[PDB]
Amino acid sequence: DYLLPESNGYLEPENELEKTFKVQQSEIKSSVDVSTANKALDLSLKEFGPYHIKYAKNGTHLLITGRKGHVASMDWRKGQLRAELFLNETCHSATYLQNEQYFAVAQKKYTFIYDHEGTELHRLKQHIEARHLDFLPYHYLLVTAGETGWLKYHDVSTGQLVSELRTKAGPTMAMAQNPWNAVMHLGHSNGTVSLWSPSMPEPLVKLLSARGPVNSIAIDRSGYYMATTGADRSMKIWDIRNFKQLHSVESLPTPGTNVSISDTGLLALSRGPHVTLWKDALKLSGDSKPCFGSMGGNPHRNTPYMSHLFAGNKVENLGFVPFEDLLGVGHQTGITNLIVPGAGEANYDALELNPFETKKQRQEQEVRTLLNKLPADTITLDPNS
Amino acid sequence: MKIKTIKRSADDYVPVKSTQESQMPRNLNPELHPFERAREYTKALNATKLERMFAKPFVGQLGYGHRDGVYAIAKNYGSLNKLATGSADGVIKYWNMSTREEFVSFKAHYGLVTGLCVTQNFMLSCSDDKTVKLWSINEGLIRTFDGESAFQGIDSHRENSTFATGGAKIHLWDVNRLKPVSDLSWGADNITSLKFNQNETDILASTGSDNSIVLYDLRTNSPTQKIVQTMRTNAICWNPMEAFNFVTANEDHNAYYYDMRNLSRSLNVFKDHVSAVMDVDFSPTGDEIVTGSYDKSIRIYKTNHGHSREIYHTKRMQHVFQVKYSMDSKYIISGSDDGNVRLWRSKAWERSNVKTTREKNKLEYDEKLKERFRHMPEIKRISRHRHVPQVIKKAQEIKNIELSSIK
Amino acid sequence: VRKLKHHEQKLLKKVDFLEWKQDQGHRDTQVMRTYHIQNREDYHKYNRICGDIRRLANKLSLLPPTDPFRRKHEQLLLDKLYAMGVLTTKSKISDLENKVTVSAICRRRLPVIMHRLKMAETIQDAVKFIEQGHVRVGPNLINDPAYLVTRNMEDYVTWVDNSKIKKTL
RNA sequence: UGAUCCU
RNA sequence: CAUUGGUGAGCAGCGAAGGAUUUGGUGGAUUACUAGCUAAUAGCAAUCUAUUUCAAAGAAUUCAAACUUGGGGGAAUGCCUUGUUGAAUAUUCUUCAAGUGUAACCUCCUCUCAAAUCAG
């Protein structure tokens, strides 16, 4: 416990009169240290479509996918850029599967698996739609939910299809994989998120999450609380460990396009022109219920921790850097990294992921993970069963 | 409005010198570490499949061995490097475990030798033609001890520099003596084997050719107990660790391990083998018993489990007649009817290399994992398994058939 | 990726990241190599029809043999596929499953046609000339390099008039 | 752990 | 000799305080101009926060839901379907077969060309 060398950043009001959420990002960029203040990027690439964002599980490479033709893998911290592909088919998402050397893009029809340089490795005959393209490196399993009812699991270690699960739910409106559990979460128009394992052809458990369609879903690091948003201007705080929505934030001004969860407990809600993050909102009490406005400054009622409004955009998606305190918000013209104080964890474990990794360390670690892949039957509702 | 962020500081995690190794900050928070069962399970399965890939028991033989067949192997109990092998022709051959070559060899007996045993180097070769001969290791035939029985056995004794013979009658000799001191018999029959225990060395275990086990006490010059067993017994071994229990090998394909306090109930039974188990030998740890059959096969198993975790066989050895365990618990010497004494591992994956402490701590961790992931079935199919020969697999099938007809 | 060890190899028995069985040996790319098609999906735009040839060629082989519709419709298939030149011969019926490749329909492509006629030196130089707007098929200058040209249209490809590469030859 | 083939 | 080739010298000739070339960057147009942001009848634009929350309104194919699959084989192991068997309480689940059943899962094809070189 005392070996833990680095401690989180904080944000403190210092008055009741002074307010926490009112800080702006140019105002933040004054006091943050120079490399960390400079780690906020403004990539306005206004020519192509709205931009999809994903950092790798280590923050070392950023992958972006504009809706029209852009596919871009930068070695994000440095000036290096690996991939810049212009496919005139339209794309939806992308993820690095194992390392920055191999990634996968979610196109109009077919998923593509791709080299760092931008070369074509593997076009999938299957995956005939691809809306959410997500990965779990602990099974080496690219799990993809298109606009189809089905859900496809490709084991890119072997390079073969594991399984394909028809939901009977229709087009997938959301998918968030569980880091702690590797159960997949699919969200559809009935207000229903289904938990999934590749073995079980019926879902593990269905959840009538909200009314209307599922806008998005996002899961804790601990796998305890998953924050779900419907298109009904509502966001539920599901505690998966006992399958209860802790708080039901009703009547947003606009339904959130996405939700995202940091490591230390931050929650990101992006209505699209606005991005708003709460601190410690996932806890058990309804005092920790995330609320927009606490009248009278009552400590029980909970205000948002950090706010932002995008002027000329309706942003697409967002994702924290997993070890740093920023979050990449993909807007129509591009990418902002909005600086949080305490979102990411300060003390990573190198033996799990390496944010500072040599290429020789990388090819050691890749072989280490491929030795430690699990075959797909081990995806279960509990890791420990 | 206190504004504070995370700073990696770009110097702690990435070191100054180019020759300096990386700093490796760890957080053992379980949220960072998702799979404590499954990833450790896959490491254990990798280790078990690797130990099936690291299943290379064979080292080599000792020299070119006997032409006529090894029947008894003596080991000097101080000498970890040297050993002795007696042939039914009568040629005694002495080997060094480093060189694996004949240190010295002698035309001992024109009859068979039945046992070689070592007490002051000094070797003692018991015959079929009523003669034991005393040889020294650098020359030959110091003194021959002539007895009235054709010598069905021998055993050494460290204290008072003594050795008894096994025969029709067991009669205890000394080094200086040419006639024995005292001759013992519980029952009036020829005795197949003898063994002094090593600690509280005065006690002896004496098999009996008409299905007998006697426990001889040198302090009384009289046996102190005898259980008349079902079938006759081949050979014996006292554990060097426990010093009051011993395993013996029986005429049926079964080895029984008995206790000096209670012979009326055995400590244990072991029946993986398919023929008359020739020889047993016990680890200096006291962990595992290794036993060689009349069948062309040896087997290693631990004392408490009771079933063969390890089985040894190959092409050019048969009816092995003898198996002798290490001084250092690391390698078993294996005598042959085929005459050639092979050097075999105690564990085929355990290697002689003194290990770098990265891989050594990893190997200790992996086998610790192998035990806490033991009784899972998918681990079990790789953990039991290795090739068994065709007739012996059929012979185990035959034994299961006959025991199924019995019940 | 690693020239991995003797001890690594046996544990990673079935894995690969370069040649997959769903990736079908990267066979399509070897045709995308030899004919230099711009988009990938042009291959699967031929191969989605190419099985559709065989899917009619197979079930017309399942009719009774002297079914007077069967021999007539197969002739109507084969005269059509012989006008487009995607098979060399028309006498046998067996080309409808053996000769119908993506490479055979892809060697009825436009720069393959000019590359046969040696107006161009290589294949990709003809593609560059179509992109430059130098070529025409009878009446029309064609901009598209991916032109399906029939056997009977093959005489109509000339250089376009007043050019700088028609005066080059 | 196992199970095929040829004189 | 035509050089109708340019170099090269030159000259006539043109010719206002230089001429000729080559390129970087940026701005302007490249469709016909009604302002920016937001939660939008309004507020903002130095700010929406210590009115943004109560309130109302808000839940069908009783489970319609691959309109998407290169083509042949098969499709062991899966699944699907009914046939058929047991259990629990009119339905799931155990068990089992029949399926020129099957976008899982196995192979064959969807490469070898009047392109060129090369012996004869």
Author numbering:
A (entry chain W): 64 to 448
B (entry chain U): 1 to 120, 134 to 151, 170 to 438
C (entry chain Z): 2 to 170
Paper text:
The first structurally defined particle that assembles co-transcriptionally is therefore the small subunit processome, a giant precursor of the small subunit. The particle containing the 5’ ETS region and its associated 26 unique polypeptides was termed the 5’ ETS particle. Recent structural studies of the fully assembled SSU processome have shown that the 5’ ETS and its associated multi-protein complexes UtpA, UtpB and U3 snoRNP form a scaffold for the assembly of individual rRNA domains, thus further highlighting the central role of the 5’ ETS. Conformational switches within the 5’ ETS RNP contribute to the regulated formation of the SSU processome by inhibiting binding of late assembly factors that are associated with the compaction of the SSU processome upon completed transcription of the 18S rRNA.
Although individual rRNA domains are flexible and functionally independent modules, we observed the 5’ ETS RNP as the unifying and stable structural entity in each of these reconstructions. Multi-protein complexes UtpA and UtpB as well as the U3 snoRNP constitute the major components of this assembly. Additional proteins such as Utp7, Sof1, and Imp3 with its associated segment of Mpp10 are clearly visible. Compared with the SSU processome, the most dramatic conformational changes occur within the UtpB complex. As a result of this large conformational change, several binding sites for other assembly factors are disrupted, such as the bipartite binding site of the late factor Pno1, the binding sites for the C-terminal region of Mpp10, the Rcl1•Bms1 complex, several ribosomal proteins, and the 18S pre-rRNA. Continuous density extending from helices VII and VIII of the 5’ ETS is for the first time observed between Sof1 and Utp7. In the 5’ ETS RNP, an RNA linker and helix IX sterically prevent the association of the late binding factor Utp14, which binds in the same region in the SSU processome after A0 cleavage or RNA remodeling.
